[PDB]
Structures are given as structure tokens and as C-alpha cells.
Symmetry: D2
């Protein structure tokens, strides 16, 4: 009965109990007989995703790994994408495989390539949309029905980029939604954290097996506070993030020194029509190709005076990165090529600065 | 040169960098490049200096220290030897992912010698142990475990603390702490610590922590622990002075049958404890001649001691596990605080007269 | 010269010295010195920030709004000085005359020779006062300083130093921090009075030191300062019309509001506080307030949650007076909760 | 119960929160003064054995909030000329600028405090031990003089000694104040002040001086840190003193030092007064090197453990040379005394 800002600001409040609207910080570890702060944040994110239960962990990787250590075992099979955000790619290709888990990598945008990758022992289909680093879109509802043909399969979606402001995968059939709260949900570049939302049945097992026993990735109470506090402005931050991005996209698309732009809002974008039906907005992550390749990325980034060179995203400050010179410096040509880092690719996370100043720093920087 | 107090206070200082003795709290999730966590790092160096290992790693819980390590050094097929009495992970979690586990009485040197398989990748130890404060010989066990070129010895040093016991000086490969207890000292942080040689540490950081657990300690929690470490030596002193005065009062007491404490010569592994440990701890278990209700009643009339399951806090904690494996139904576990010993004893003395 | 969001987010940052955009929290009391040959780096960033937003020379942080005004007042006054402000000090040899600061002539005719401080607050039933016109007046005495509590308006609507005011003070406790969890005060003015207020008022007279943690919190709050104020006012504009269809509504954006023209002239926006007067008595207000789901019953202003107050149940005040602090919620849910409660 | 148990447990709300650790009420807005800070106010007040405690955001915040409450233009203050730095500035240039009379005497001489009383003398303000040479004064006898005048409150700055050593309220003092920034927090990471006094006096200090005249509010996080720091308050002071006592012996005999000011040295002016007020003689040491100015510089610039800083009462040993910096004082920290002595010796060499 209540809107997104309202939900984020008030869901889970304990004002009738403490007399404060602001949740006290229970910086404690010894409860007495004869964590409250984290719970509020868990009830909040659940409300925002419209699921039954939330779980907080100390990082995005803590939220994913705790979930996968709970619902997997040796002998299980996992279907995911050839390109995921790293760290979860290392967990998939190197970590689970040392412990008897089969992992098939496919193009999740191809619906049938997902269908025929599936086996009796498939326990997890794990998806990302939008996804690094060309913002691949992927039809979550189409994929969830092509995976529940197997009555034992869970669909897990990393909803970090879209946030519950643009996408609620649990409404499109998904079973488990995971967030890197480090990005947009906290929003303030000062917290590593992760969140999970799923049914109460599943959530209780991820908390009491995967979190308590398999990772121990507890979120600190002060960090739980920082995220509750961050959420008070979640809605207007995403509004300004997305409003700034759209203008920056047009700037980059009509720029002579720029060859291509990757952005789910463009109609030239691959999964454009898919992106339009499941996303209320087209996101604040923009990627684009540079004409002058490697040395054009270096020179562009080395002249920007307002944008900050970093490999996080979702901060109130605008962050820019050039995977080839930085993140993927010690890689091969074909390691980077497919998929999908090229020599000119630049990643931008649009912050909340006044868009005129972001573009002015972009403009002078492109020359 | 430096004493334990000097080491815990100054090891890893960056006072040359910030012009401050107190380490700034780098509450950040984004580092920026010149071209195309220091708070936690200070704490990682601190625990390493105290245990006299190469390298420290911090995690958001004790279980995040232990799990991060085991996901690093194990794979499907490996075998683990550990003690009978973290248990869910050993007994249910690893076995679900193709690791084999043998539980033995690490008390008996030859049960360990005989549980050794060739694919034994980890001997995982803990001393003193729960809840009867079982002692276990770390040096003897490392020689046993190391006749396999591939076996790592991992010791949970949470109870002993590097004030009383440095397992790496006795041949151990890896030390883990639930920093939640004595190292932080203040009942207000969940956190874990690992100390090992540089190459094992790098692998635990960049495989176990980064990809397998993601148990990142919050910078603010790191700061609290650094601050807790400023009083680590005097706290362990007062913990252990208190605890010894209290042990006597409980041994020579009418309604207490037995008192589990490594400092008593009647305690099973007292001679091992005495060579291993610079002191005998601040955990006291004991049994009341009343069993249950001894027991469930004594704990109800306590007015200073608090009813909790954690340990190593500034306040004295107590619990009665009966409210099948070591838990004799008259057993009571005391975690001795920093209070004045008169007041703890008087409180205990009072609540003992109520039965 | 960048936009309000860019300077709120980026002004005063030491991002190339720490390798992070987030300022390290210097939870410290004692600095070491390199060789044998009163301020905090985190706090210092905050002071630089509010100074850049007010387009002033220097900022000072204090552990409360009252710490901010009392620190400056104990600097710039002595026994025998005189103060004029709008309808404590007197126990220590300063005389205070209270005038209606919206009567230009009533202020000008109250200027004594020993008048050292004129202290204004606009908005305040949201009374407006002409800050430029009142400053020319006070400035007829060379040793008179004008001090404006710019808390209600913000540097997003009002920059008093650009209208000839000498000192801006804020209870950052309200809009600037935004999130209801910090008591703090701020002061912006010229460098040399700033150094006087710090080294005398703050150092010896009050000791009202802002904690570095609270300073970090406020810097964080300022990261969304521009978009919070946008959203606040927009919600206020929609709720103000709704409330105005209760006999009367006090809001500087209604042209039927007394200082509407001074307001339009000085304030780039009309603010996010609303007062209105309920037709029913002392017991129709308390009945409304004892009956809202969303709005919360509290005496403060500028949070993310919408707050409301019936100053009667909780001279100036009537039995039908209600103060509304419009939060950041979705507008329809706010309006719905006002509505359901009015019935 | 004992001083450790009190500092750990006084003011507990374990019955209501289900935790031994006080949650951090990081709030400004209450629905229908702070619960974390309150727990700390009851803690200090139990430690000093007064009725009520107040917390301010600074030692100066504690002091000025007290003075701005109990004084008025026309009143008179008797205080010492050797006073803590910023208390001096306030007393000398601040009160006098708002109608207050201050006479600076030597509070060692009971005859010249008696002879500085006036009918309108509202406050006698004392400091024992006192900078920069650990001066001692008789709290009983001075409170007996001041109280012959029926409107005179005696205010004592109990920072150095702390309630581990000196409880002025039991010696007849009316108000005790603290820079909790030092020993009480203990950890060199908080700026805070504390007042302990009678309830009626405290309510006025709270609701006049704090609420209206200074607004020197302690943040709730800073309040949490101090409650935490107090969890070990007893054992830090015990170790502070044992270290400093041994450094005292060492410093008293080193050929390159003239005199060693410390209250436990029976050679010290005021020794027998300290022996009756003080349960222990403190952890500040000062001394004079025969090399004078260039000896101080060259000592402090060869210390590798002792840190060169202004403050005192931290877990780290702090050192400062009053001729090189503020215009030799030693704050003994919690290190092993052997390490501290050896760092002093290798630096005394030079």
C-alpha cells in the first residue's frame, strides 16, 4: 500500500520500541539470558525486493558463497554465464570445481543454449542482468520457467546493478536474489556488504548452514547501520543516478572520438526489448568503446579531474575505469577479447554530481 | 627485545604516516588510482607480531577465519583429522563436499598417528579445549602430523591466547583465533584472525577469503580490536590472577565435586599444559555435587556474573549447558572477568549457599 | 564553480592523499610531532564543505547548533555590549533588546551605539525578514555584526553572506546532515573572525568540539544534500496545496504569505517546513496527531522521515497550530496519512 | 563493591537490552539527553561517589558549562596562577570580559587563599596534582576555608589523579570535573569532559550551562568509546602507576637529571598532603636535565618508543619538552617498563 521511498525509509522500523526513528547500533557480541540492527536491514531489503526474508553478510561474495554452500553438494551441477563479474567467476570455475560441483558456462541470453545445458543434477541456474562489461541483458522470466522444468533447480540472480528500484527478479519467478550492498544499496562507497532475499524456508537454511558454518561472513553492526542510513535516500539516489546517465549516454553516442556505447537504454542495444519489459529504468552503468583504443583510454582517464579512477560502482561520486590498462593488464589478447574486454572499452559508474559538471570533465578529457 | 605489552601496543604502528598514534578508520569501499584496507592491515600485523608468525589475516568472524583457511588448503578427496568434541563444518559441511573427516581423541598421540592417511591434508587442533579444558601436546602432534609431507597443522589458539601459548613456535603451520573473545576483550565485536607463513597467508587471503567466504572484517571492527589490543597484556594478567584465586575457592568447596582447570596437578594434561603454556587460562569449568538444579539454581541467584555463552569479555560470564558429550549434567562453565576478585567470589559464594 | 551537488559531494576532499574518496575517520585526540620543533582532519573537511556551500571563507564545526551560536557569541561580545534580536546573556553584562525584525524601521530605531550583534532567523509562522535590508541598517554602526541562523533555509535556498551578513550559523542537526542521527553545529564567516571564534569561543568559552565520527556522518549526509533538498521542497509544494484546500496555511511560497516578496527575492526556493492552523481547537489537532500512520510525532525538523508537531499539546502558538516537517517519502503516502487523519 | 566492578557494571541496562554492551543511540530525534551518554554519566558519578554525572564534548566543555551556570557578572573567583593551559585562558581573559573578578593566588599557601576570599567570591577552583611540576594542595583544608563563605562552591579538576587515587567530593569539594580525554577514556581517541556533583547542582549545570550557554554535547559514539575505555580503567591506572613508580626511581638517579618532580618522592613539596588524599601518586613524571635547553631537544629527538606528544593518560607513553614545544614532562604509558626505561637510557646517552 506504500511507495519505494516510503518502503526504504520506514520498512522494519522499531520506533515504537526505542522511541527513536534511528535504529540504535547494537555493537555487541554477548547476548544475555536468564543482531537487532542487522535484522532491520534484512527486513528492509526483503520489503524492497518483495520477498519473505532477508539475510545480511559482510560482502557480496559472502552473500553468494553462503548461498551456494547451502544449496549445493558434491555431484550437483551448476549452469551460469561465460561472463560474470569476477570473484564469482573464480568461485565458479576454480572454487566449486575443487569440491565436486559441475559447472557449465553458456550464453544465458540464448534461451535454448540454457535449456540443453540442463541435466537432472542441475541444482542452480545463476544469472546476472544487466551484467559486466557490455551490460548484457538476459530475460529472467523466460529463464526461470526453462529452469523449473527441473523440480530441484533453484534460480539465483545477482540483482546488484539493477537494484530493487529497476528490477525485482523474485516477481519474474527467480528463487534467490543476491546483492552486493557495497554498490548502489548502501550507495556511499564506505561499506563492503552483501544481502540475500528468498523464501523464509530457504533463507533459514542459508543463515543456519551457509552463513553460520560455511562462511562466517557476518556483517558488522556499524556497517548494518551505515546501510540502513544509506537506504533512507535509496530512491532519490537511483532517480538522480538514472537521470544523469541518460544525458551522459547521448553525450557519448554523438561524440566523434567515441565508436560505440553499451547501454540497455539504447535501441541498438542487444537485449533492449527484454530490458524494457523487466526494468523500470535502464540503469546508471554506462560502457563505451573508444576510437583510439588502448592509448585513448589511458589518456582519457589520466586527464579526468572530476571523475575518479576506481573499480567500484554505485557510489555518489562518479567512477571510471579502463579494464585493459588497469584490471586486465596481465592478461592475454584472447583472454580479454572474448569476453568481453577490448582495447578501447571504458566503464563508467554515473554518480550524483550535477550532470553538467560530469560532462564538462568528460568533454575536456576526451581531447 | 619488546615485551608483550609493548608489542601489542606498538607493533604495526603508522604513527610516522598519520602523525597520530591512533590508527585512522579507513571506512571505505573504493580505492582510487594515481594513474592508469590500512586499518585492517595494522591489525593483521599486530596479531602476527604477537604470535611471531610472518603474516596475519582478518575476517568477520572466527568461523570466517577457520572456513576461509579450510576452503583454501583442502579439495575434494582430502582427509582431515580432528578431535571428537566448528563441529558442524567438520562433521556436516566438508563431508558434503567430498572431504573425509576422522574424529579421534587428540589426547592420545597414537590415535592421531593411526588416523593418519596419506591424503590427510589437515590436522586441526584446539587446546585448552571445550568444555573440560582438555590439554593436548602441540609439539608432539606436529611431529606426528608432519611425517606426511602434505599435512598442515592448524591450531585454534582462541582460549590460550598468544599471551599464554604461541603454537607456531611449537611446529604448528596455522593459528586461528575467534578474536571475538580475549583479543578484542570487550564483548562487542565478532571477528576472526589467522596467522601463518607468507605463502599460505597469501593463498588464504586471495582464495579462501576473497572467493570462498567473502568474510571481510569491517574497518570499524578492526579499529575496535586494535583498541582492545592496547590493554591485551594487563587484561590477560587480571583475567588469570582472578581465575586462580577463584579456582582455589571452588576446589575446596563443599558443594563442588570437581574443578576442571589446567593449573591443577589433578587436571589430566597438567604437565603438557605446564610446558606449553606460559599460564593456565581464565576459563574454569566445574561440577556441582547437585547435578542439574545445582546448577540451574546456582545460575539463578547470581547478581554479578552474567548468563551468556561467549567468553573473554571484561565481565564475568557463566552458563550451564544442561539448559551427552563432555556435558556432565552438573557441569558449570565460568569465564573469569576483570572484576575485583572479592566481588566475583562473594557473588559465587552467595549463590552457592542457595543450594 | 560547479553545481550544488558537485561541490557538496567534492568540495574540500583530500582524495589524492588517502587513495580513497571517503575521508578516513580520525578518531584521535593526541597527535605526535615529528621533531621537537584544537582541530581534526576529518572535521576540517566538513568545515571546508559548508564554507564552500555558503560561499564563505572558513567553516567551524561544533558539537551542536547551540555550541555554534554560543561559541561565536562568547567571542564577539563583552559585558556592556548590546544585542538586538527578534521577540543568559543578561546575567553577564550584555543587554538584549527584542524587536520585530520584520519592521525595518523598528530595528533601525533600536540600534544603540554599543549594539554589537544583530541576530536574525529567516524563515522562523515562517516569518520572513529582509536580510540585505536589515544588514545595511545594522552596518550603520561600524562595530555591529549581523548573525543569521540559516538552518531552516539551507545553502540550497539561501546564502546570507551574499546579502552582506557577517556570520552564518547552522544547527547541522537538521537538513545538512539530514538523517536524524547527529547533534552538530556549524559556522561560516571570514577567516579572521573564524580564527577568533575557534581560538577563543570554541577553545576556551564553550569547548563544544564536534566528534570526528559525527563529522564523518555529516560529510556522508552532505553526499545527498542537493537531491534531499530537491525532494523535500517538491513534497512540500504538493502537500502545501493539498493542505490549503484547516482554515489557514503558513508557507513562504503562498503569495498570500506576509513576506512572500522578500522570500521570492532572497530564497531560491520556499523551504520544506509547513505550518497550518486547524479549524478545530486544541482537541482537533491532538486528535489528528494521535492518528497518523506515516508521519512521526517529534519536535525536530529536516530528517528523511516526515515529522509533525502540535505545539499546543507538545506568545506565538494557537490551539489549532500544527508544524509539518516534510520528509523524503513518496508524496501520495504522506498525503494519504494526513488525509485519513483529518477525518 | 570494588573499583573495577564499579567501572565495569555501574549503570548497566543488561536487564533491558539483553546485552552487557550499551547500544549506541546514534540519534537526534526522539518520538512520542541520550541513553548511551546517560550510562556514562552514571558511571563516572559512581566512580567519584557523587550523586549525578554530566557529560560534555570536552574538558573545557565540562568546565565552562559549570562556570557559566554558577557564576554571574559581579561574582569573584579564587584560582591558581599555575593552571592548565586552556583553563587559564578562560579564567584570565574570558570570565573577566563578562563582569567576573578573578584573583590568581598560589593555592599551596592556605594563608593566601584565606586572604583572597571576598563576600562575593562564588567559586574556588583547584587542581591537584597541577601542571607542570605536579603541585599538590589540601582539598579538605581549602574546602574548609572556601566554605566559611556560604555562597562559595569549590571546583576541583580531578583529571590527573582520577577517582582511582583521589575522590574530592569526599574531601568536601562541591564539584569535580574531568577531561575524560586522558586517563578515563585512556586510549587517546576521544575528546570529552565529565562533571560529578550534587543532583540539584547537576540539573542546573545540565539545563543551564550545557543546554544554553555552551551546547557542548558529547556525541554518542564518543560516549560509547569512553564506557568501553572504563571497562579496563582500574587495571590501566594500576599499571600506569607501577610503570611510572619504577621510572621514577630510574630517573631520580640518572646523572644527567637535576630534580625529579613526582608526588611519591618524600623530597617533593607537598608529599605528606598527597599521602593523605591520594591512594597512589600518579603516572605523570617531570624532571630537569642539567643540559637545560639543548639537552631536552636532543633527548626527545632520540626516543624511539616514547612518542613526542602534548596529551597525557594514553596507553602509549607520551613525552614533551616544555621549552621546545608548548612555548621535561613524561606521561607513563602501559608498555613494559623495561622497554620504556631502555628507550629513555639510549636517548639519555646522547
Amino acid at each position: 500500500k506504500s511507495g519505494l521511498g516510503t518502503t526504504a525509509i520506514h520498512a522494519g522500523t522499531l520506533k515504537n520500541l526505542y522511541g527513536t526513528l534511528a535504529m540504535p547500533i547494537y555493537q555487541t557480541s554477548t547476548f544475555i539470558f536468564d543482531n537487532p540492527t542487522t535484522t532491520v536491514l534484512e527486513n528492509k531489503i526483503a520489503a524492497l525486493e518483495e520477498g519473505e526474508a532477508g539475510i545480511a553478510m559482510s560482502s557480496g561474495m559472502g552473500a553468494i558463497s553462503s548461498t551456494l554452500w547451502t544449496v549445493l553438494k558434491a555431484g550437483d551441477h551448476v549452469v551460469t554465464d561465460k561472463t560474470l563479474y569476477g570473484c564469482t567467476f573464480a568461485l565458479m570455475n576454480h572454487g566449486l570445481t575443487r569440491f565436486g560441483v559441475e559447472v557449465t558456462f553458456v550464453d544465458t541470453s540464448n534461451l535454448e543454449e540454457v535449456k540443453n545445458a540442463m541435466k537432472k543434477n542441475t541444482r542452480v541456474v545463476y544469472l546476472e542482468t544487466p551484467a559486466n562489461p557490455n551490460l548484457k541483458i538476459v530475460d529472467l522470466e523466460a529463464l526461470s520457467k526453462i529452469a523449473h522444468t527441473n523440480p530441484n533447480t533453484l534460480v539465483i540472480v545477482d540483482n546488484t546493478f539493477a537494484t530493487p528500484y529497476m528490477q525485482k527478479p523474485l516477481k519474474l519467478g527467480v528463487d534467490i536474489v543476491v546483492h552486493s550492498a557495497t554498490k548502489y544499496l548502501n550507495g556511499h562507497g564506505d561499506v563492503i556488504a552483501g544481502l540475500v532475499v528468498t523464501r523464509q524456508e530457504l533463507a533459514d537454511q542459508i543463515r543456519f548452514v551457509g552463513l553460520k558454518d560455511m562462511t562466517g561472513a557476518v556483517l558488522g553492526p556499524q556497517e548494518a547501520y551505515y546501510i540502513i542510513r544509506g537506504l533512507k535516500t535509496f530512491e532519490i539516489r537511483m532517480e538522480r543516478h538514472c537521470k544523469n546517465a541518460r544525458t551522459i549516454v547521448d553525450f557519448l553516442n554523438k561524440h566523434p572520438k567515441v565508436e560505440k556505447v553499451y547501454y540497455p537504454g539504447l535501441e541498438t542495444h542487444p537485449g533492449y526489448e527484454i530490458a524494457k519489459k523487466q526494468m523500470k529504468d535502464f540503469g546508471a552503468m554506462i560502457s563505451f568503446e573508444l576510437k583510439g583504443g588502448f592509448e585513448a583510454g589511458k589518456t582519457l582517464l589520466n586527464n579526468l579531474k572530476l571523475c575518479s579512477l576506481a573499480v567500484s560502482l554505485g557510489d555518489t561520486e562518479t567512477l571510471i575505469q579502463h579494464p585493459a590498462s588497469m584490471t586486465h593488464s596481465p592478461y592475454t589478447k584472447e583472454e580479454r577479447e572474448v569476453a568481453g574486454i577490448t582495447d578501447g572499452l571504458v566503464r563508467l559508474s554515473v554518480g550524483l554530481e550535477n550532470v553538467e559538471d560530469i560532462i564538462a570533465d568528460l568533454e575536456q578529457g576526451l581531447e
